[PDB]
């Protein structure tokens, strides 16, 4: 496991103490058994998300400092849009409060646009893997997500460049079976997040907006980790080896028609979105629409000035190679020390987060009493760490049948937030993880003392079985 | 007119600047006649909204350098929970990124909880009067939005005490009409922004709930402007005169079951809004269920953590009667100035804006020529100052037709941020509109040089009828 | 009297209060009649100074976020080398952590410097009028402080263009009466502090460098106000009528060869100091050694990397005309609202205070008695506005017989904040002094309760003689 | 080496960049290859000190913020005051803008006070070590200051737990030399900075102390670092080893009558000081009036109210133990690098900084040619790194002689901030010298292109001998 040192120094610190292993267990039986109802008072490293906890420069904050907050045509609107046409050479952009605001105000829009002229009678959105928000906006505008992620993407110990690539066999055996006319739009997601941030290919990207094009579909960049997936194509594509990230970033866009963008993720924000269009004037002024009830006006979006000036420059921070190659190269730190003490985990590490599988921690856990999760809760009665299950508590149950539905596997989400944590908060992690490896043979699995009907893993209370 | 003192001093500054009379003339062509098009670089003082451009405190900023980024359980959700607590006496709230995503979060599941028992099958929503993104929520989910204003209301000159109030008679009327049934909820908007800011009395909002009651229908406080609502109560209904303004706040929130609340207004914020609930636990877990894939998780609502911590100590901040005093009395300075020099307004002036009857200015501008439009341009190039037009450029055209809706009255609204101006902004807005009386007689009207179909007062370009 | 609309609007404000009459009356007894012994909280408006209590732009502090901390070489070290040669066309700049730590810098080495040849041995510091601590400075290295101002200064009431002018006269009649060699310096301050604030004239300033240089005697220009003096040369003469306020500050230091400056004036900050030097390299390279044990490191002079930021952006925003005029005019405004009510004031108003003669309010009380002194306790009582003595109770007693010193005048100095208070402060402060007329024949004197031996007005108690 | 995690997170970042060997053989060039004169920009990692470059908590720039900038009784004053009472127990304070500046207060006023008694006739101060300010206003105030050091110190490699304790046999031999009426202070500095951060115990602070009451002498403390002081009373006195940190400094100030302190390295400020005296009123009143024209007025002495604000905040966090661990640990990590490595350093390292002997290091340069200072501009333009030299560079000529010094001690001083470098930063250094083997034994002297005659080590052009 190698260091990479960080090229920056702090300016601020947050305090974050270790609560005593009694506090710990007072907590978690507060929480239901359940991180995702722990106070953040309750935690010591939180490894939750990726998603708005990022370190700020002294840059960005001083660029919130003298934010604009007109209500309309704020100096930093069009920053704003001048730092997407500088950037992926689109000429509209339309500010969201975050990312999934971005996917209410474009996707609905997509759909009245392709069903204008009478078509996307049973319209299904396909993608390399739909995030849950994503898949989530799809399915309520009542259409079909559709994940056609690499089969290499299965495989979670064997190594590939791009386990985040379309199948494009795929891709082409559903557009026959649905038809060009159904298919509202093909997301493209950088990196994608579902498959665990693991990258697309410049030619993966390439060929599917190719195909998008001979048959008239609208492609969407889903492009919350758009500088990791740069970062990759960079480091593991010889054709971009000596080009800067900048560059890398530019020809990806030239394989979409619009972007939707969480600026919570890769432009190191605590909160922001974007949607932004190459040209067509028609969905820009249809997503508008949609945009003033929803998010807010136009040139703020759901956002307060000092944010879109805080996004202008973090946009600038994210796409910096030095920064992201400590940043990546830290989440590589945790896998690689996981990896060596034996600990299976997804390999390689995606750009935001390491992946453990917990179904060889606890193999003596059937998955309908959540493995991964009875680990999680260990790792937090150990350490104050608190971590997120991707796995049988994350996928719920069968909406017709009611039944657990089958996960493929059992995976404790270790998620790095970016500029936050040093090298020995990820020993910290590690040595935690890998010091409950003779106790895992003896953890017990988890039952239901309260579930609802839905979205079950964020407030659901679980007790153990005993 | 009186002059009210600062309660506070002046800690920082933003530069503006009256641009040259050629660079004013040709920002407004630039913009097409349209000042929602101009630049904010191009307005001296800006009085299109009081939405999100207030001037926060040292206490507030503060607030947010400390704020809790955690993605849950952040320390300012549990802070805020207690204010709502103190403030309104509800006991579940779910942040959101600002007024209308309150809304987007509360109105659907009100009516998916009223349709469950087979009923609301032709659903209505009543209100005092609805705001614009209240009314257009209510109409995307596929119901009638209904507005019953007492008739006092709309004689503008003659003075009030509860120009906002329900009318009671058509309040029974509706309900008769429709059926307990149909109403999915009534809405009490205070201030009531659509009459001009205009308070609602106690005795009305408590008659209204009385009434809601009898037939069990649920009541949702739009809570944008309550706390110059309660400035209000305690000025004008002598039972009050000797209270508190939390203590008029904790009895106008006795005749509610939920709030919705823009807290870019009265909270004096930038960006935030709130749902708050009093005690029904079944629309408070419906909305968390609609809140995650619109918002963010339920503990930031789509805000980041430092933006709650703003709105704990803006929501304490706004309810000061000192500074209310004072706000209220530099909107009630602005009209005596205008009203004095004879130029007719609103009368009494609301909580947060002007409103200037423009017919009365250019009776040779026909309403259909935007008579309140040439007025609000010419006050733009005399002064810098940008306000907005609330007449017939506004209403728009009937949708089934294509007509253009004639509106009664053609106002110009000159809307005062919190903390923010001077009366010595004050008189400037004042004496350039009062200097344009010679002026007045021989102003042109407008017409369309570009409309688009929806959002047409926002983006259309308008050329004078040479 | 004219209001001047404020170049700028309110970004962050400060809560002050009006301390209740008996507070008020608790507060000054418990100060043992000592405003200056007054904690803030029991003050509303603070007048006691113009100094460090500044509001800055958000310019100001964003520069201070991204301010450089480095102990050498401070990337804000040389943007403040660079901004004052564009100045003052300067090449040595030292940081000082605020005027007095630069006139501890620079006075003793100009001293050593003139002694270097074995002359100065009654040496002294000739000025239009030394500032107190300037003043302190000179004397405490063994000099003379010499005052010469015209004498239209002394005429309170008399309007002139120049009160702050040198007596050209006493000049060369204290150089021929000390000699060229006894004299190590001249201090031009601009504006004329002890005068009130009155500006010099450029024909001023420059016959008395040009008066040094045929002497030998070494110039140096006491800036704290230097941007308001600026600011009056263009508005009083002729020369200048067309001049921008830099061209003004330009010509103002080809009359000088170094400069002292406290930063918390004119450069509009809260702390801060300079020593500029024109081109000897010899005396730069002495003040250099003088500030490492007293100040600090030559690339920051005790300050921090953020006030050097705020000093290169203060220093910019200090000479904008447009602020110039409304502050200046701010205190006009003060100043013609109490002499159109028949308050004797020194006229015409300074830059950044007005002074009002309390000998013509309160006659029946001796000098003794500090009449001044009883007229800011008073005002306080009325009002919670704090203003400071300049007066018999400043002046002291004299050294040799410890009998109380005669004081030519009696003023109350209200000093006036940078961009903190509004004109409706201003008439705050006048119609409370007004509001005293009928009550000023009633007031009594006050005697020690307790006088310590230097700096008493700064510590003294006093109580009412009845 | 043992790497110790954060006891925090990051929360915001300030961007550091490696320039090219090209980049820092030119800057390095263009500095004369004295890195004093080096800008920061051409600095990767700083470590020429630890004073006023730290990493402030969001809570000390929250306390900024809400700073009071009154003239005269801020309200962080009063809780300055109060803090100085809860740590130190003494009763009066006077704020200073940085540590040189409370000596510039206090110092004069101990001299004056025993001149006034008949006593001081031949004064002299004796300390465990003086600090370079501290000595230089001794000396610059007439008086002999005298360093007693235990003889510990002087061996560099050999451990000891208190390196820097008084010699209590030497000081009762100056007492009975000088005579207790010429002693005007005895300066107990802890940590003695000039020992190399190395701890005072507890007993030797007690001996001292009690040997001065029985003298009738003065005590201070220098209290720069009290706080990595009281860790290491804690860490290696088992007396201590169950008390706080707020107990053992409580009981370290029982032993002095005053302090001075620079808030610019423990109390983890940029800038910032401070006089605390115990009880003596007359001291405290000679003081102050020497702080009015040195300083400023006794309210604020030369800082900004926002900075007495982060001071209060600064000294709790500065005592917290897990902090402190943290802190001192991490100068331990880098000593034991080099340790490991073969590198010679002083042990056991201080609570700030590493010093390595460079004599060791390239034995073929001799003392005349700076070996120290050749193995820094080295370290520079192989790493980045900026490092300060503690050799005959920075020992000087012998004033009646002219020739070089003979220093007993090569060191490169390795001056770590607080909170601002993580280990990975330490490791970046450590790797950086320890990959120098090879080129020292060919590294080159240097010789001076331009030398002046006072303080030359800050301002010296060197020139390689090559
Ligand atoms: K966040
Ligand atoms: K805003
Ligand atoms: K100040
Ligand atoms: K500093």
């Given at each position: 496991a190698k260091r990479i040192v960080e090229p920056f120094r702090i300016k601020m610190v947050e305090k974050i103490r270790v609560p005593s292993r009694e506090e710990r267990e007072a907590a978690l039986k507060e929480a239901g058994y359940n991180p995702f109802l722990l106070p953040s008072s309750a935690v010591y490293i939180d490894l939750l998300t990726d998603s708005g906890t990022n370190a700020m420069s002294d840059h960005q904050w001083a660029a919130m400092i003298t934010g604009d907050e007109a209500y309309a045509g704020s100096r930093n609107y069009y920053d704003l849009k001048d730092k997407a046409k500088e950037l992926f050479n689109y000429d509209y952009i339309i500010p969201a409060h975050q990312g999934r605001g971005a996917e209410n105000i474009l996707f609905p829009v997509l759909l009245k646009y392709k069903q204008?002229?009478?078509?996307?009678?049973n319209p299904v959105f396909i993608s390399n893997f739909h995030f849950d928000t994503t898949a989530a906006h799809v399915e309520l505008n009542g259409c079909k997500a559709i994940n056609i992620v690499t089969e290499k993407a299965f495989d979670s110990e064997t190594y590939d460049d791009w386990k985040g690539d379309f199948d494009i066999k795929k891709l082409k055996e559903n557009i026959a079976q649905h038809g060009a006319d159904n298919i509202v739009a093909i997301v493209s997601t950088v990196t994608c997040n579902s498959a665990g941030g693991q990258p697309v290919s410049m030619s993966n990207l390439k060929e599917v907006y190719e195909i998008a094009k001979q048959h008239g579909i609208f492609v969407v960049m889903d492009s919350a980790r758009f500088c990791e997936n740069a970062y990759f194509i960079k480091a593991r594509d010889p054709k971009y080896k000596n080009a800067t990230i900048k560059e890398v970033i530019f020809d990806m866009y030239k394989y979409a028609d619009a972007l939707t963008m969480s600026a919570k993720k890769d432009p190191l924000l605590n909160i922001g979105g974007l949607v932004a269009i190459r040209d067509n004037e028609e969905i820009f002024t249809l997503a508008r629409q949609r945009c003033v009830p929803m998010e807010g006006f136009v040139t703020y979006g759901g956002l307060a000035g000092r944010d879109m000036a805080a996004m202008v420059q973090g946009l600038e921070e994210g796409t910096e190679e030095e920064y992201l190659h400590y940043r990546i190269g830290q989440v590589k730190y945790l896998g690689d020390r996981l990896r060596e003490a034996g600990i299976p985990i997804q390999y390689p590490t995606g750009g935001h987060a390491v992946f453990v599988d917990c179904k060889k921690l606890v193999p003596q856990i059937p998955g309908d009493q959540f493995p991964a999760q009875a680990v999680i809760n260990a790792l937090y009665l150990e350490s104050g760490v608190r971590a997120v299950e991707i796995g049988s508590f994350l996928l719920?149950?069968?909406?017709?049948?009611?039944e657990q539905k089958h996960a493929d596997m059992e995976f404790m989400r270790l998620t790095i937030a970016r500029r936050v944590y040093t090298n020995d908060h990820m020993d910290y992690i590690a040595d935690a993880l890998i010091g409950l490896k003779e106790k895992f043979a003896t953890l017990k699995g988890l039952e239901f003392e309260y579930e609802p009907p839905v979205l079950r893993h964020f407030t659901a209370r679980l007790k153990p079985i005993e």
């Open positions: 204008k002229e009478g078509k996307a009678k719920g149950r069968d909406p017709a049948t009611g």
